[PDB]
């Protein structure tokens, strides 16, 4: 008659047995792989205990936000550039987290072993937690920050710009569209392990350096949940290593997942970090080299070699294209600044020294371009100038990769300067690398995403911005801006003045 | 070092001043409400709505979506990441649904966490109070270990039936509700196991192994049709709405409510069992919580949709007829369990009345909402045939 | 050798150890309280240790009283054989028959020095405390400030040694 | 404004710079453990002990005290703020006590808040699930609205019994436990009323007023003897320990445990009432929680005191006897309640089996701890002598 | 079958009927008043709702503390002087909160109406919460601060010094010893309404000014509970306003309560504020006047007039003795620094200017003395000088008021300089004011508190400190210090070598 109870592991010991056999007990999704029926999970959790450990984390997180951080005015005392960066960082990750919800629901469907299902189940709830956490950062910055615009409506204002398209590739469609296993590689084996986990921590560093204590509070909490997602991605490889098909397709799917993720995050994360901050933490190059080459290409991939896992055959090219990618992209992001939901800034003198110091040759190329644009009055509303024009006058067309959605300018880029243009059944397609090209050639019906130039063709710039609600609450001032100062903000009419009309750059080819 | 090496922009004098100097004199927009453009269900926009609605990146070609264009990458063959093709139901806006309990992740795990910790406190108090002494041994070893135990597989199967909807739901609000309806189901299955595990600790000789309950589920007669229905709902239905609707608005509303409430909750007390009712209270609380979401989605939003109301009711009516039969069959076989009770436990009249309660609650709460014509005595009569 | 542990305190731990009689101990405590507690104490030589000493005696007196009395007695009979309820009712009477605060205060303090547990049972003691104390305050707080300090000092019978007020 | 006119030393560059310049290279003492001088009851010092032990400013003349000298201000008459004179019990240290559950304010209110929020959720589920339907109209309007309710005044009385202890307790650790033991008691009393109030909202003619249950308590014969025991424990005892010990290690351990467990907890189910048992689950969880604190104080600390072990046991045995009789009486008058029950509800065979459980448990958890040799058969006999 | 529940207010409506009449249904404590049995409380709470609102508060508080505040190292980036000040503020207030537990318990026992008993009960629990909250502050600063000593053992190290004696008078004995109503006035009518409630907010203000974000996080949370204690102190007067004894005793216990509390806090609080900090918020004089006169003595007491309550007759006297009280006290505090459990600092130049500016005449008195002591080496261990010596040399006796326990030096004071010495039945008694003298003359047996000089008489200084554990971890360095720098900390030996022996100052009249 002594006080006794039962914990999670005591019930979990019998969870594997919850599933039973029957003819139609099989996954509803197409797949080339067969997940082992006796696969097991790393953490012995049940719904009750999962809820409890997450609830404890929430107490601390929301406690800090609602009380001390609010009393300290932490929502305001952040560098302007970083407040803008978090509009993109938090909302884009929000979609990654969100799609990861459906992604893991699909893995949970694929798994046949009760334990492996339960492992993914925990992530399904985690991904919902993460969607809401990311949404909370934008919610908090909109309520307490220096510029709510964009933070308060990214879910619809993000649709105006080209950067959003590539995001839905690697953190949306790339998570749920295809073979469940392929989707798992994009999400867990590559996405999280190589980029997300190291990314979340890196973001908290850049945040603190720029006065932001909101993001560290939330993201560091999200990070404590990533242990379980690492085990899931790892068990996916283990649950299929004993299948003959694994030796035929595993490396192919891994290589594609690798390139898919890298193609977008390599240039976009670096851009957000170095151009979206005042105080620098570390040059993107060495950060990348450590993540992709050491912490992943060697450490993480080596451990899975015992299951047939090899090193991505495109890893070489990825590195060769990496170094300048983010620099190449910011020129485009700034040139197309009117299509965003955030405010951008030209590098200041102190920053140009930093860039040039860590990337020799940066000034003779990018530095001078920015200086010219400044001279042309790119920051001034009465200049009647937008960098896009500069690309027109100098014959530097901007294309959109049919596959990755990543914008590129081959005649100006220091990284990949390749361009492949094809015509197929009455349509034109532009590719930026040999891997994306193979993907489309072999899987045309998987990549039909229409690009902004295609959808906006013949439309006057200001009309597109107005239609998609790219304005602030005054109904006249643009959410997006070419500078982060508090005065002289471009208005919808300042864009109208300009009478800029979109054109599809691929129509020039005969 | 006491101060550390990393300097923070919020507290570091030099960096903060650099930051403070670049700040505008006031916010660059006075609209500090994230999600301000969302149509509020209630008087004012709720935190639940702001943090949830439109998180799903749907384009306008999926009713209610704000984005544009195709998905960036689709399945081999062409299937879209999300699309209209995954369900027979149609609506003017997939984002209209609202969990009446307004549950987003934080509130959800908070409530479940409280229930967990209190459950632990309850068990320790139960074992310490030695209440197990007055519980009928037969009820304990036969009906709780085997029969209540076998039911966990029923709940587990219903949990699994939600796996495709978690992947295919056409909006954030629906995906979140569905995920929570399924998570609550697996929680209940685990609470059934938890009880058995607890009994094995305070009852000498009680085996917590699932072998007996599982064999009852996979090969017994009492749950035969229940298992066939569950296997069907889970693996033979590819439509995420048919799954959620049929599970909660047909099968669980009739069979599950009967088993949990009209059998175990109703009879456990007669055998000195206050333990099982403790867990059934949770299961029933969860059932009523889900019912609110289920009614909002299928009746308030889809069944009453301004453009597809007639269409949706026709379809749901179709699904009710399709799953009412297997559900009646499951109840019919379950009637066999009454013959196994000690003589004098209950009688045909009590059993019939309890069936009418479940059927009448179903008709009022579900069937009538889509004008499905249900004959209560016909349904009850068909089930009673199973009484040995 | 000062605040918590000192020669003088030790002297009493030995002096109390030689007490093996509810009679003797109860007596010593009674005398002790008359000798060192309250403003009316016989002297202040033990001021720094009396509170601690007194407790060590209540201890010896308690242990004995328990091993000497019986169920019914330990609950209604003082360590002096007196009948608690009786004494209580007696002191309350004298108190309610007090002509003034000067007389009342003497009753109350005297009551404590004599019947403080382990002497009188706690139940009756604290109950008396509630009644006696109530009477004392009622007389004292009536027109509290009417008597000027000069006259009040004479009433208290205090020896004024020095005064200065600019 | 956006920045606020108030400069804060942690974030203001100028002020923080001054602060940082004044800081020492490292902490001026490596012992960063508050309460490091406290003697741990367990392996390592717990947060509960650090935040509680020695909060009370007692001087050395009160067993365990660490301060010196008399109080600064006392009662008219000379009565000390806190003194050895407020309780018959003696010990080497009033700070030895430790609540096994280690409850300081935070954990305490956290647990109760969860129970409150779940309780609300449960009630909304019960009412929505129409579980009330299987409820016996008699039991509801009679045994619950009259005899159950009346029991609330019992708990309430035991609540107030703690008032003096909350003022006279001789230590922080004992004062906090006492306060929680009493706060839990009034909680239960309010829960009893909560149910009567809930029933009122779902039962058309059910009257929530305490008028009936009160009169039953003040004039009834069922509790009459029990009400007299309460009044005494509360207003006739001026010894905080006697009050705590007697109330928890005698009265509530016998009469209370019986009325709650052996009567309502064992019968309410039989009348289709799972509502009341929900609340009794709380009250019993609380009882077992308080029990561990009571045991540690009076047995582990006082009863087994390295210097007053025999002395204290003598006083507790004495107190036991003193209150064991009024407790027996309270029970007898309670036995006259089965008579109002419909025939068949229960027989003398059961009533006897239950009584022996209470007494046996009582003897096993309390009586045998202080060597209060008691006779189970005699006791049950005296109580049982109250049946029809 | 609609979802239904029951709230606190619906159950509380019947709470008043919970109690029932009968013979001994009366208070166990001595009182001169009769609290009406039909008295009602303002907040209709039940145990469960009370726990909920408090739990929600804890969540925010502890979340901030364990998360964001720790990450920001808030426990360290606080001014040294303030870190020391909080050792006293938090621990001294803790005892107040702790005895408030017994007080409301005694009050709960006094009240006869079920609702009034319920009110006090809510506070009984609140005070327990406040005890633990104050304890958590010292615990947090001990665990993460720049100097744990003191924060880590104040509960025993506070017994060495004289300032602690006076604290027990106003926040311990004053709270529980005497007529229940008198104790209520000291606690809720005076202490809480006039000092504690306004104080707690002030403390967070000074704290914030000095880098302390910990105390604000906890104290502001304590502040939210005070609106209930105010209602309690108010309902105390309402419940006895109809009793005839009220018109005859009320204003007397109140005046005595007012004097008692102000006697201590007037000099002590101002001292902690102005001398225990670097950055100033507001001159104590201006603060005192607003609190004591306006807020309390004006608005608050005015509303109680209809219940026969009048302004304390000792009001004008208190305002007279107030101006220099705190300045006078710090001289004694610093002079006796070796008896504390905290480190003191002498005013720096900016501070002396601040003092002179707000207290004309301050420099010529206190300022010159402090510069004299410093030049003589009061801060340097090798000087062999402790300011107490200076007092002896210049024949400036320091006495301890037998009633309030407040230290006072009549020959040097700039404020009150009255002194009354008396002998009664072989014992000398020293008084600092006419009100305290009357209290003693009238109730001799209520005030027999031995003072430090009496208990430490003949004892050598370092011996008292070692016995009472006034040491840091190294077993040699003193917890107390005459400066707040990291080097040249005084050791027990530095004190022993001085041969300072305590003397009872009253014997000079023999
Ligand atoms: O602050 C920013 C925001 C977006 C971006 F692409 C770069 C920097
Ligand atoms: O920092 C302090 C600590 C104590 C004191 F009395 C004055 C200032
Ligand atoms: Fe995630
Ligand atoms: Fe993840
Ligand atoms: Fe308080
Ligand atoms: Fe308070």
Same domain? For C75 and C125 the reply is: yes
| Residues in contact with A173: Cβ distance below 8 Å, sequence separation at least 6, in sequence order | A99, B71, B72, B73, B74, B81
Give residue numbers after which chain B breaks (C–N above 2.5 Å): none
How far apart are the C-alpha atoms of E440 and E434, rounded to whole Å? 10
Q: How far apart are CA B178 and CA B99, in angstroms?
A: 10
The HSE-up count of residue D270 (CA atoms within 13 Å, CB side) is 16
B117, D111: Cβ pair inside 8 Å? yes
Say how many CA atoms lie within 13 Å of A38 toward its Cβ.
1
The SS3 assignment for D59 reads strand
Place of tokens 């240290």: D93
How far, in whole angstroms, is CA C19 from its chain's centroid?
21
Q: Is residue C151 part of a domain?
A: no
* Given the residues A134, A183, A378, A409, the one annotated as active site: A134
Angstrom distance (rounded) from CA A123 to CA A117: 10
Which pairs from D377-383 meet CB under 8 Å and 24+ separation?
D379/D328, D380/D352, D380/D355, D380/D356, D382/D328, D382/D332, D383/D328, D383/D331, D383/D332, D383/D335, D383/D355
Output the six-digit token pair for A172: 């949306």
Q: Which of B3, B288, B361 sits opposite E3 (nearest CB)?
A: B288
What's the CA gap between A488 and A485, in Å, rounded? 8
Which of A260, A255, A268, A257 has its CA nearest to residue A408?
A: A268
Residue in chain C closest to E249 (alpha carbons) equals C141
CB–CB of E493/E463 below 8 Å? no
Structure tokens at E314: 């000792």
Asked if A5 lies within 8 A of B66 by C-beta distance, the reply is no
Chains B and A touch (3+ CB pairs under 8 A): yes
Among residues A400, A416, A409, the alpha carbon closest in space to that of A452 is found at A400
Catalytic, E449? Answer no
Q: In this structure, are strands A420-424 and E419-424 parallel, antiparallel, or unpaired? A: unpaired
Q: How far from chain centre, in Å, is Cα A500?
A: 29
List, in sequence order, the alpha helices (H) in A336-413: 349-358, 362, 368-375, 387-393
Of C68, C97, C120, the residue that ends a domain is C68
List all residues of chain A from 46 to 105 with a beta carbon under 8 Å from chain B.
46-52, 54-56, 58, 62, 72, 74, 76-80, 94-95, 98-99, 101-105
Continuous segment of H or E residues that includes residue D230 = helix D224-231
B43 at E interface, C-beta within 8 A: no
Tokens of E110: 């006094």
Using the Cβ of E132 and the Cβ atoms of chain D, whether some distance falls under 8 Å is answered with yes
**Interatomic CA distance for residues E476 and D29, integer angstroms:** 12
Residues of E within 8 A of A59 (CB-CB) are 59, 62-63
The closest alpha carbon to A246, from A307, A304, A178, belongs to A307
| Residue C155 in domain | no
Helix (H) or strand (E) holding A422: strand A420-424
E421 DSSP β-pair partners = C162, E430
Q: Say how many Å lie between the CA of residue E81 and the centre of ligand 2.
A: 8
Q: Say if residues A77 and A70 touch (Cβ distance below 8 Å).
A: no
Token duo for residue A35: 């997940």
Concatenated DSSP letters of E460-494: BHHHHHHHTT-B-TTSSBBS-BSS-SSSS--BHHH
Residue D94 near residue D62, CB atoms below 8 Å: yes
Q: Which domain holds residue A5?
A: 1-510
The residue contributing the CA closest to ligand 1 atom 3 is A85
Give SS3 for B42. Answer: coil
The CA radius of gyration of chain A, in Å to the nearest whole number, is 24
D170 to chain E nearest CA, in Å?
A: 10
The tally of CA atoms less than 13 A away on the side-chain side of residue A453 is 20
Is B105–A132 a contact, with Cβ atoms under 8 angstroms apart? yes
Rounded CA separation E266/A115 (Å)? 68
Domain boundary among C22, C53, C68: C68
Residue among E1, E73, E146 minimizing CB distance to B4: E73
User: Distance between CA B273 and CA B132 in Å, rounded?
Assistant: 8
For residues C9 and C52, the answer to whether their CB atoms sit within 8 Å is yes
Q: Nearest ligand, CA of residue E154?
A: 2
Count structural domains, chain A.
1
Instruction: Look at residues D146, D241, D252 and name the one whose alpha carbon lies nearest to residue D199.
Output: D146
Give the start-to-end residue ranges of the domains of chain B.
1-388
Q: At which residue do the structure tokens 């405590």 appear? A: C29
CATH of the domain at E161: 1.10.620.20
Helix (H) or strand (E) segment spanning residue A408: strand A407-408
Q: Please, are residues E89 and E275 in contact by the beta-carbon 8 Å criterion? A: no
Tell whether the torsion through CA atoms of D33, D39, D42 and D48 is positive or negative.
negative
Query: Which residue shows structure tokens 């299928």?
Result: B298
Q: What is the spatial distance between Cα E212 and Cα D52, in angstroms, rounded to a whole number? A: 24
> Among residues A61, E225, E2, D108, which one has the least CA distance to residue B110?
A61
Residue E389 and residue E354 in contact, taking contact as beta carbons nearer than 8 Å: no
Q: What is the distance between the alpha carbons of residues D199 and D190, in angstroms, rounded to a whole number?
A: 14
A396 is an annotated ligand-binding site residue: no
Pocket test for ligand 2, best of E275, E331, E334 (most atoms within 8 A of CB): E275
In this structure, the strands spanning A407-408 and A399-400 are antiparallel
Dihedral of alpha carbons E245, E251, E254, E255, sign: negative
Distance CA D246, CA D88 (A): 13
**Contact partners, residue E160, CB within 8 Å, separation at least 6:** E339, E340, E341, E464, E465, E468, E470
Distance of CA A137 to the CA centre of its chain: 16
Q: Distance of alpha carbon E313 from its chain centroid, rounded? A: 23
Query: Which three-class secondary structure string do you get for E72-97?
Result: CCCCCCCCHHHHHHHHHHHHHHHHHH
Q: From the candidates E124, E453, E468, which should be mutated to test the interface with D, based on the most D CB atoms within 10 A?
A: E124
DSSP state of E240: T
**Which residues in D lie closer than 8 A to residue E69 (C-beta atoms)?**
none
Q: Is A97 annotated as a binding residue?
A: yes
Residue A424 host element (H or E): strand A420-424
Strands (E), E373-477: 399-400, 407-408, 419-424, 427-431
Contact yes or no for A371/A379 (Cβ under 8 A): no
Provide the residue range defining the domain that includes C56.
1-68
Which residue among B18, B56, B79 places its CB closest to the CB of A278? B18
Cβ atoms of E34 and E246 within 8 Å: the answer is no
Q: Which two tokens stand for residue D302?
A: 């006082």
Is residue C161 one of the residues assigned to a domain? no
Tokens 């009523």: give the residue. B288
Q: How many helices and strands (H and E) does chain D possess?
A: 16, 0
Residue E415, exposed/middle/buried by CB under 10 A (0-12, 13-18, 19+)?
middle
Domain's final residue, options C68, C90, C108: C68
As a whole number of angstroms, the distance between CA D17 and CA A273 comes to 28
* Quoted resolution (Å): 2.3
Tell me the two tokens of residue D337. 């309640």
- CA dihedral defined by E17, E19, E20, E21, rounded to 10 degrees? -120
- On whether both C12 and C47 belong to a single domain, the answer is yes
d(Cα D58, Cα E173) in Å, to the nearest integer?
11
- Return the exposure string of A193-225: e unless at least 16 CB atoms fall within 10 Å of the residue's CB, then b: bbbbbbbbebbbebbbbbbbbbbbbbbbbbbeb
Instruction: Assign 3-state DSSP to chain E and report helix, strand, coil percentages, each to 5.
Output: 60, 5, 35
Residue B177 exposure: Cα atoms within 13 Å on the Cβ side: 34
Across the A:E interface, residue pairs with CB atoms under 8 Å apart total: 52
Dihedral of the alpha carbons of C142, E186, D159, E52, in degrees to the nearest 10? 150
Neighbours of E497 (CB within 10 A): 12
Q: Distance between CA atoms of E322 and E271, rounded to whole angstroms?
A: 12
Length of chain A: 510
D305 touches chain C (CB under 8 A): no
The tokens 């009794």 sit on which residue? D280
Residues C48 and C100 reside in one and the same domain:
no
> Residue E245 corresponds to which tokens in the numbers above?
């004894």
Q: How many domains in chain C? A: 2
Distance CA B376, CA B368 (A): 12
CB atoms within 10 A of CB E347: 21
Tokens representing residue A423 in the block? 């015509």
Instruction: List, in sequence order, the alpha helices (H) in chain B.
Output: 13-22, 47-52, 105-128, 137-138, 149-160, 163-168, 172-202, 211-219, 224-235, 240-246, 257, 266-267, 275-295, 309-334, 348-365, 376-384
CB E346 less than 6 A from any atom of ligand 2: no
Q: Is the dihedral of CA E90, E96, E100, E101 positive or negative?
A: positive
Kindly report the CATH number assigned to the domain that includes residue C42: 1.20.1280.10
Three-state secondary structure call for residue C139: helix
Clarify whether residues C136 and C74 are in a common domain: yes
Those residues whose C-beta lies under 8 Å from the C-beta of residue A401, and which sit 6 or more positions away, are: A263, A407, A408, A430, A431, A432, A433, A436
CA dist list (Å): E5 to C74, D53, D130, D202, D388: 52, 40, 13, 10, 39
Q: Answer whether E81 contacts ligand 2 (Cβ < 6 A).
A: yes
Within 10 Å of residue E127's Cβ, how many Cβ atoms? 26
Exposure class string for D221-246: b at 16+ Cβ within 10 A, else e: ebbbbbbebbbbbbbebbbbbbbbbb
Q: What is the DSSP letter of A339?
A: G
3-state secondary structure of E504: coil
Experimental method: X-ray
- State how far the alpha carbon of A439 is from the alpha carbons of A250, A260, A401, in Å: 16, 10, 12
Query: Based on the number of CB atoms within 10 Å of its own CB, is A107 exposed (0-12), middle (13-18) or buried (19 or more)?
Result: buried
A24-to-A107, B88, B157 alpha-carbon distances in Å: 17, 22, 13
As given in the structure block, the two tokens for residue B79 are 């299937």
Would you identify the CATH topology of the domain B1-388?
Ribonucleotide Reductase, subunit A (1.10.620)
Measured from CB, residues less than 6 Å from any atom of ligand 1 are: A 81, 84-85, 88, 271-272, 275-276, 333, 342, 344
What is the C-alpha to C-alpha distance for residues B142 and B156, in angstroms, rounded to an integer? 21
The whole-angstrom separation of Cα A109 and Cα A120 is 9
- For residues C48 and E450, the answer to whether their CB atoms sit within 8 Å is yes
Phi, psi of A7 (to 5 degrees): -100, 180
Q: Widest CA span of chain B, in angstroms?
A: 85
* Rounded-to-integer distance, Cα A440 and Cα A402, Å: 8
Q: Of how many residues is chain C composed?
A: 166
Q: Phi first, then psi: what are they for E501, rounded to 5°?
A: -115, 130
Task: Give the pair of three-digit tokens for residue C43.
Answer: 């002297």
Rounded CA separation D190/D192 (Å) = 5
In this structure, are residues D158 and D189 in contact, taking their beta carbons and an 8 Å threshold? no
Distance CA E246, CA B330 (A): 77
Is D28 within 8 Å of chain A by CB? no
Task: Using an 8 Å CB-CB cutoff, list chain C residues near E459.
Answer: 2
Quote the CA–CA distance of A51 and B114 in Å, as a whole number: 9
Using alpha carbons, list the distances in angstroms from residue A9 to A45, B154, B213. Answer: 7, 22, 20
Two tokens, residue B93: 């806006």
């Amino acid at each position: 008659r002594a006080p006794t109870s039962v914990n999670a592991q005591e019930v979990h010991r019998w969870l594997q047995s919850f599933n039973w056999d029957f003819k139609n007990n099989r996954t509803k999704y197409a797949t080339k792989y067969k997940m082992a029926n006796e696969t097991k999970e790393q953490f012995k959790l049940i719904a009750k205990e999962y809820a409890r450990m997450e609830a404890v984390k929430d107490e601390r997180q929301f406690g800090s936000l609602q009380d001390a951080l609010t009393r300290l005015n932490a929502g305001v005392r952040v560098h302007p550039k970083w407040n803008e960066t978090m509009k993109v960082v938090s909302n884009f990750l929000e979609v990654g987290e969100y799609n990861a919800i459906a992604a893991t629901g699909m893995l949970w469907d694929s798994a046949q072993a009760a334990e492996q299902k339960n492992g993914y189940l925990a992530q399904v709830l985690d991904e919902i937690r993460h969607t809401h956490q990311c949404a909370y950062v934008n919610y908090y910055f909109a309520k307490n920050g220096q510029d709510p615009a964009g933070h308060n409506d990214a879910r619809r204002t993000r649709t105006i710009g080209p950067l959003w398209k590539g995001m839905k590739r690697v953190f949306s469609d790339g998570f749920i569209s295809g073979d469940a296993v392929e989707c798992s590689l994009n999400l867990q084996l590559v996405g999280e392990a190589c980029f997300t986990n190291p990314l979340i921590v890196a973001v908290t560093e850049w945040a603190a350096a720029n006065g932001d204590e909101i993001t560290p509070t939330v993201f560091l909490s999200i990070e404590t949940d990533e242990l379980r997602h690492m085990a899931n991605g790892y068990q996916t490889v283990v649950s299929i290593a004993n299948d003959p098909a694994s030796a035929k397709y595993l490396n192919t799917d891994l290589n594609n997942a690798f390139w898919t993720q890298q193609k977008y995050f390599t240039p976009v994360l670096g851009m957000l970090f170095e151009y979206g901050s005042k105080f620098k933490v570390e040059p993107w190059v060495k950060t990348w080299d450590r993540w992709v080459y050491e912490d992943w290409g060697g450490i993480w991939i080596g451990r899975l070699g015992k299951y047939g896992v090899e090193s991505p055959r495109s890893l070489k090219d990825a590195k060769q294209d990496a170094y300048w990618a983010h620099h190449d992209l910011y020129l485009l992001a700034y040139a197309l600044w009117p299509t965003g939901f955030f405010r951008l800034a030209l590098p200041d003198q102190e920053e140009m020294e930093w860039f040039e110091a860590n990337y020799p040759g940066w000034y003779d190329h990018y530095g001078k371009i920015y200086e010219e644009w400044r001279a042309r009055g790119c920051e001034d509303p009465s200049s009647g100038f937008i960098p896009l024009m500069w690309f027109i006058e100098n014959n530097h067309p901007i294309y959109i990769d049919r596959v990755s959605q990543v914008p590129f300018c081959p005649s100006l880029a220091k990284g990949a300067s390749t361009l492949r243009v094809h015509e197929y059944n009455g349509e034109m397609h532009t590719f930026s690398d040999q891997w994306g090209e193979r993907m489309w050639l072999a899987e045309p019906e998987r990549y039909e995403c229409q690009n902004i130039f295609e959808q906006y063709e013949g439309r006057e710039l200001s009309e597109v911005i107005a239609e998609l609600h790219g304005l602030r609450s005054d109904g006249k001032t643009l959410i997006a801006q070419p500078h982060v100062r508090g005065d002289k903000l471009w208005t919808l009419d300042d864009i109208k003045r300009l009478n800029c009309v979109f054109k599809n750059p691929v129509k020039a080819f005969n | 070092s006491m101060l550390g090496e990393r300097r923070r922009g919020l507290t570091d004098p030099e960096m903060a001043a650099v930051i403070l100097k670049a700040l505008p004199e006031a916010p660059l927009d006075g609209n500090n409400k994230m999600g301000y453009f969302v149509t509020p269900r209630w008087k004012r926009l709720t935190e639940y709505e702001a943090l949830t609605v439109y998180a799903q990146p749907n384009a306008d070609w999926i009713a209610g979506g704000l984005d544009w264009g195709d998905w960036t990458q689709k399945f081999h063959g062409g299937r879209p990441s999300w699309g209209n093709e995954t369900t027979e139901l149609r609506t003017v806006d997939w984002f209209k649904h609202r969990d009446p309990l307004r549950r987003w992740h934080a509130p959800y795990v908070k409530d479940k966490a409280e229930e967990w910790r209190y459950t632990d406190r309850f068990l320790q108090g139960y074992s310490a109070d030695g209440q197990i002494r007055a519980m009928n041994p037969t009820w304990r070893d036969e009906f709780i270990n085997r029969y209540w135990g076998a039911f966990l597989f029923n709940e587990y199967g219903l949990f699994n039936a939600h796996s495709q909807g978690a992947r295919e739901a056409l909006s954030d609000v629906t995906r979140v509700s569905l995920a929570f309806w399924g998570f609550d189901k697996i929680d209940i299955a685990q609470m059934i196991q938890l009880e058995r595990g607890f009994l094995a600790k305070i009852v000498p000789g009680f085996d917590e192994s699932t072998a007996v309950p599982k064999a009852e589920w996979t090969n017994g007669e009492v749950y035969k049709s229940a298992r066939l229905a569950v296997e069907g709902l889970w693996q033979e239905v590819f439509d995420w709405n048919e799954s959620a609707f049929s599970v909660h608005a047909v099968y669980d509303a009739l069979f599950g409510q009967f088993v949990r409430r009209e059998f175990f909750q109703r009879l456990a007390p007669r055998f000195g069992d206050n333990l099982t009712p403790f867990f059934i209270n949770q299961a029933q609380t969860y059932f009523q919580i889900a019912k609110q979401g289920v009614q909002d989605l299928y009746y308030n939003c889809l069944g009453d949709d301004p453009e597809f109301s007639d269409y949706n009711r026709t379809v749901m009516r179709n699904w009710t007829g399709k799953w009412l039969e297997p559900t009646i069959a499951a109840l019919r076989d379950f009637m066999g369990l009454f013959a196994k009770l000690p003589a004098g436990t209950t009688d045909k009249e009590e059993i019939t009345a309890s069936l009418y309660r479940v059927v009448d609650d179903w008709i009022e709460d579900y069937a009538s909402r889509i004008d499905f014509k249900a004959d209560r005595d016909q349904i009850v009569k068909a089930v009673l045939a199973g009484l040995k | 050798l000062g605040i918590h542990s000192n020669d003088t305190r030790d002297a009493w731990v030995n002096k109390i150890a030689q007490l093996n009689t509810l009679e003797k101990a109860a007596e010593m405590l009674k005398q002790f309280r008359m000798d060192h507690t309250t403003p009316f104490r016989n002297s202040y030589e033990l001021d720094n240790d009396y509170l601690w000493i007194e407790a060590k005696l209540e201890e010896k007196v308690a242990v004995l009283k328990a091993r000497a009395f019986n169920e019914v007695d330990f609950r209604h009979k003082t360590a002096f054989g007196e009948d608690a309820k009786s004494v209580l009712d007696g002191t309350v009477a004298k108190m309610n028959a007090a002509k003034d605060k000067w007389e009342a205060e003497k009753i109350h303090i005297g009551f404590r020095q004599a019947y403080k547990p382990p002497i009188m049972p706690v139940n009756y003691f604290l109950d008396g405390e509630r009644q006696l104390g109530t009477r004392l305050m009622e007389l004292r707080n009536l027109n509290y400030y009417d008597t000027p300090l000069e006259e009040l000092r004479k009433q208290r019978g205090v020896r004024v040694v020095h005064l200065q007020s600019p």
